[PDB]
């Protein structure tokens, strides 16, 4: 596998994957529990700008 | 090409990509004509998760 | 990384990336300001084909 | 790792790796429980035609 | 193979590699029928720069 | 290059590459201003384990 | 596909994949119609060395 | 070259590639003088499972 | 990911990654539990040769 | 090294690198002593098509 | 991008691609401003050796 | 081997690997006989800034 999940996202340091810091959704990761890598951004940006257009 | 179609999907070998055998949707791939790889699921899962949020 | 933006899109020659011919949607890259590569088409086809499908 | 098991075999969606459907060999994957990818077929073909010749 | 033709040039999508639309020189590839990728420019520029010298 | 700084390090979202929040050392990345990727840890752990041993 | 057939075998220049010249074994590729590359040899030797051992 | 011999097996530390130790096969690499890597094991497993099937 | 742990280290088959055999340092991996690949030696040697010089 | 000479050229089987069979140039490798791979062909074709033209 | 400029040439470290230090042709790379890698020499060699010979 | 020594270090043009010019220590590569690539500095800098924390 050329590109794996850990090529695409890093586990959030702030909320350590929980998506919420003590009741409140976590601001570092937008409630995702995960932060994008350069590679993940690259892929997501491409799809977003080209998908269905 | 780092990541080709054949790295994402396997042509279902029963119906040879058709999706049907003699009219009846193929009993292996079950329509899709294609079966996803670990790598294909990774990408799709990543996008499904992060797209538009 | 393994696959960058430049592996996925080329800068369109007609509009030079602006996507617009002084007001009018550029007819070459169809507004995008960019043209997809084999690799970019592969990714985008896969995602459109299987996303939420 | 360059080329993983998942790059070579996909799990069979009919029998989910069991190789059998209610006693009899699974007709999708032909009893193997697994379906080869283009990459897998490539390696195997090469070996089959050249090994011990 | 590591570097294929499709990694080096894009089929000009406007004319399907003809370089001409309805008698007219196609504006998206400039008659060439093909647009160079970042990768293709790199190799070509590198050979341009160092070959015979 | 096959492995760039951004393949190894991600920018710290909490401190924005500063390493400090209001003077006190930043808790999320523990002083660095940067969070390591799976690839970054793979590399770093290998080196720490075998270096000068 | 990280390693293709053409990464493994080259088409024979003497017999263009036929394996015989005039009816007699083709002395260039010794009947095979194909020549192994360094990569092909590597895989073949590895497998021949370890298989069933 | 995508996958080398050294990607597939490591030189045994006890017998430095020779198969024997003072006469009898080496207690570590069991005669082979080499130790398989994750990658080499993967290939060999795959071939043993599907070859002549 | 481009370079994984198993691309750098091989799990020692004489001691199952433990390091010690029946209390004594293992003759294969020399107590480490792990044997380095050519890839792993190349990184290590590069770092030990250039680090802090 | 991503692509080596062995990935580009194979040794000629008829002349075994000599480029000459009994005084007269080798009709197989046209005297070069070497045969191109698909990768070598694609690289060479690209450069010839685009080099300062 | 499989093979980048940086993979082919190194910026001469004393002059920073300038080719000159204070008017005088740079002693280190003496002119080019750049030093070829093994990878760069391999492609260049190949092209020089095979281009319309 | 994804990343070899020749992807990290380049032979110094001035001292041709010897690190020395007629006794006088080489100023191009400051004694080392080798110049680092962009890839080589990436890894060395990453290791230097994170090692021992
Ligand atoms: Zn979070
Ligand atoms: Zn089917
Ligand atoms: Zn345009
Ligand atoms: Zn099945
Ligand atoms: Zn066109
Ligand atoms: Zn921080
Ligand atoms: Zn032949
Ligand atoms: Zn041994
Ligand atoms: Zn051990
Ligand atoms: Zn010849
Ligand atoms: Zn210089
Ligand atoms: Zn020097």
UniProtKB/Swiss-Prot annotation, chains A, B, C, D, E, F, G, H, I, J, K, L:
InterPro entries the record matches: Anti-TRAP, HSP_DnaJ_Cys-rich_dom_sf
Keyword Glycosyltransferase: no
Top-level taxon of origin: Bacteria
Induction (record text): By uncharged Trp tRNA, via the T-box transcription antitermination mechanism.
GO MF: identical protein binding
Spans through the membrane: none
Repeat region (CXXCXGXG motif), residues: 12-19, 26-33
Gene Ontology CC terms, in alphabetical order: cytoplasm
Location in the cell: Cytoplasm
CDD domains, sorted: anti-TRAP
Keyword terms, alphabetized: Cytoplasm, Repeat, Transcription, Transcription regulation
Pfam family, one: Anti-TRAP
Record's subunit section: Homopentamer or homohexamer.
Purpose of the protein: By forming a complex with tryptophan-activated TRAP, and masking its RNA binding site, it inhibits TRAP's RNA binding ability, thereby abolishing TRAP regulation of gene expression, leading to antitermination and increased trp operon expression. AT acts by competing with messenger RNA for the RNA binding domain of TRAP.
UniProt protein name: Tryptophan RNA-binding attenuator protein inhibitory protein
Organism encoding this protein: Bacillus subtilis (strain 168)
Designated gene of the protein: rtpA
């Amino acid at each position: 596998m050329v590109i794996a999940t850990d090529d695409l996202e890093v586990a959030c340091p702030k909320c350590e994957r929980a998506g919420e810091i003590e009741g409140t959704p976590c601001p570092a990761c937008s409630g995702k529990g995960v932060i994008l890598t350069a590679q993940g951004y690259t892929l997501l940006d491409f799809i977003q700008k080209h998908l269905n257009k």
